[PDB]
């Protein structure tokens, strides 16, 4: 399973400096939504330029204008883009079409999806190939965690590759790894760590320890 | 009844030139989501700097990290920020708190909201002050329109200010104006018009007919 690192609240200069601390233990660099909104597509270009051998995820959380926004992101160097599971299937399909043209990948972020099993069935039969269960940072602040949603996802999914995000840290990463997601997403645990390299090491170690 | 102009697919230099054609007939300048993603917060700053007397809306379609992203947008000069009606009430409340701090305004975009009446009841009770019914551009491409949703919204809303968006043009703006929305949102009809100024004039004229 891959380690995806969410860069949410950093500026581009801050992110360029921070990545040097952890990049060797990270598989996917995520340009977080506020980061994208802050800097624009230049964030993707700059990061993909500095770390050409690393995969870059653009966390656009697309809700509309699927193909146009996806293409903008892919053209900029992104290897993945996120679209909201709560959006219309038309939009999800437009994003995926843009991904296919680029030979890249759409990740459907299932944050706030009310009926997970029904939605998963619908999205998979619509062509969705990779789904992320996600308890958002605002939800985490209220004490919520993604594990219950991950459990349902793993029971219902047929073929989809699966990612999981929601305040995961070195203290809890094993709980998630044991369930066998394809991608574990971590942000705050690492970006706000006193020793980011250390936290990154301990998390990636767990992911590797679970073949 | 205000006219809000959505700039979705333009670059910043294109937007700056385009606005000079229509600005006198628009009340709210909207930096659309792909535009924000493309350019970043600089799009808001540049536009608010050139047109200081015009209101600027950042169509961020916030789904998470409400306060942080809203504050970033408001600091940048935005008068409004959009948050997704489908997101968690916690995120909606976070955005609104950020707006109150800045003395500005959050617009809840109700795009893809499954159960409109139940959702506006919930949001209005939670503090939501301004709601936008919205059939997205991807949905429009499939032949859908916002009017049915606007009818329900107007029947259910208690005190919320109401906006409407969904492929509205000079040929259909009358149907919407008659229902008495507070804000009419137009994008493609104007940005792709052979005569942008003329389309902006025809639409703003209709809005004024309804004192």
Q: Measured in whole angstroms, how far is the alpha carbon of residue A2 from the centre of its chain?
A: 11
Q: Which residue has the tokens 């999806």?
A: A113
**Per the structure block, which two tokens stand in for B150?**
């606007």
End-to-end CA distance of chain B: 8
Distance CA A196, CA A192 (A): 7
Distance CA B48, CA B19 (A): 12
Domain encompassing residue A85: 1-211
- CB < 8 Å & 24+ apart, contacts of A203-211: A203/A3, A203/A25, A203/A168, A203/A169, A203/A170, A203/A173, A204/A3, A204/A25, A204/A26, A206/A170, A206/A173, A206/A174, A206/A177, A207/A1, A207/A2, A207/A3, A207/A173, A207/A177, A209/A177, A210/A1, A210/A177, A210/A178, A210/A180
Closest CA to A57 of A38, A85, A76: A76
Cβ–Cβ of B64/A40 closer than 8 Å? Answer: no
In sequence order, what are the beta bridge partners of A55? A28
- A–B CB contacts, 8 A cutoff, strictly below: 127
Chain B CA closest to residue A60? B37
Chain B CA closest to residue A139? B90
Torsion over CA: A87, A137, A39, A204 (sign) = negative
Cβ–Cβ of B84/A63 closer than 8 Å? Answer: yes
**Per the structure block, which two tokens stand in for A101?**
């043209």
Separation in Å, CA B73 to CA B48, B83, B105, B144: 12, 12, 11, 30
Cβ–Cβ of B139/A88 closer than 8 Å? Answer: yes
Torsion over CA: A22, A25, A31, A33 (sign) = negative
Closest CA to B115 of B123, B106, B104, B105: B123
Going by C-beta distance under 8 Å and a sequence separation of 6 or more, which residues neighbour residue B90?
Answer: A138, A139, A141, A142, B66
Q: What experimental approach yielded this model?
A: X-ray
Distance CA A154, CA A188 (A): 25
Q: How far is B62 from chain A (nearest CA, A)?
A: 9
Q: How far is B36 from chain A (nearest CA, A)?
A: 6
* CB neighbour burial string for B84-102, b if at least 16 within 10 angstroms, e if fewer: bbbbbebbbbbbbebbeee
Are A169 and A146 a contacting pair, CB within 8 Å? no
Q: Measured in whole angstroms, how far is the alpha carbon of residue B29 from the centre of its chain?
A: 9
Distance CA A83, CA A95 (A): 7
Closest CA to B142 of B178, B112, B108, B119: B112
Cβ–Cβ of A41/B38 closer than 8 Å? Answer: yes
Q: Which of A8, A42, A111 sits opposite B63 (nearest CB)?
A: A111
Are B133 and B154 a contacting pair, CB within 8 Å? no
Chain A CA closest to residue B8? A65
Chain A CA closest to residue B71? A34
Are A4 and A184 a contacting pair, CB within 8 Å? yes
In sequence order, what are the beta bridge partners of A133? A164
Domain count, chain A: 1
Are B44 and B73 a contacting pair, CB within 8 Å? yes
Q: What secondary structure, in 3-state letters, does chain B show?
A: CEEEEEECCCCHHHHHHHHHHHHHHCCEEEECHHHHHHHCCHHHHHHHHHCCCCEEEEEEEECCCHHHHHHHHHHCCCCEEEEECCCCHHHHHHHHHHHHHHCCEEEEECCCCCCHHHHHHHHHHHCCCEEEEECCHHHHHCCCCCHHHHHHHHHHCCCCEEEEECCCCCCCHHHHHCCCCCEEEECHHHHCCCCHHHHHHHHHHHHHHCC
**Per the structure block, which two tokens stand in for B130?**
């301004």
Q: Which of B41, B72, B112 sits opposite A87 (nearest CB)?
A: B112
**Per the structure block, which two tokens stand in for B160?**
């919320």
Task: Phi first, then psi: give them for residue A66, nearest 5 degrees.
Answer: -50, -55
Torsion angle defined by CA atoms of residues B201, B207, B208 and B211, in that order, rounded to the nearest 10 degrees: 180
Q: How far is A210 from chain B (nearest CA, A)?
A: 30
Distance CA A92, CA B55 (A): 32
> Which chain A residues have a beta carbon less than 8 Å from that of B137?
64-65
Closest CA to A59 of A165, A140, A162: A165
Residue B206 sits in a domain whose CATH number is 3.20.20.70
Residue of A34, A91, A134 best to disrupt the B interface, most CBs of B under 10 A: A34
End-to-end CA distance of chain A: 8
């Amino acid at each position: 399973m891959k380690l995806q690192l969410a860069l949410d609240e950093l500026t581009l200069p801050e992110a360029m400096v921070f990545m040097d601390k952890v990049v060797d233990d990270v598989d996917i660099i995520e340009v977080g939504t506020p980061f994208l909104i802050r800097e624009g597509v230049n964030a993707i270009k700059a990061i993909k330029e500095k770390y050409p051998h690393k995969e870059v995820l653009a966390d656009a959380k697309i809700m509309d204008g699927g193909h146009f926004e996806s293409q903008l992101l892919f053209d900029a160097g992104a290897d993945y883009v996120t679209v909201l599971g709560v959006t219309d299937v038309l939009t999800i399909q437009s994003c995926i079409r843009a991904a296919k043209e680029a030979g890249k990948q759409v990740v459907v972020d299932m944050i706030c999806v009310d009926d997970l099993p029904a939605r998963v069935r619908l999205l998979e039969e619509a062509g969705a190939d990779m789904l992320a269960v996600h308890t958002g940072t605002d939800q985490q602040a209220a004490g919520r965690k993604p594990i219950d949603d991950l459990i349902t996802m793993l029971k219902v999914r047929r073929k989809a590759r699966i990612a999981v995000a929601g305040g995961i840290s070195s203290q809890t990463v094993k709980d998630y790894a044991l369930l066998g997601p394809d991608v574990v997403i971590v942000g705050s645990a690492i970006t706000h760590a006193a020793d980011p390299a250390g936290e990154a090491r301990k998390i990636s170690q767990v992911l590797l320890q679970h073949h």
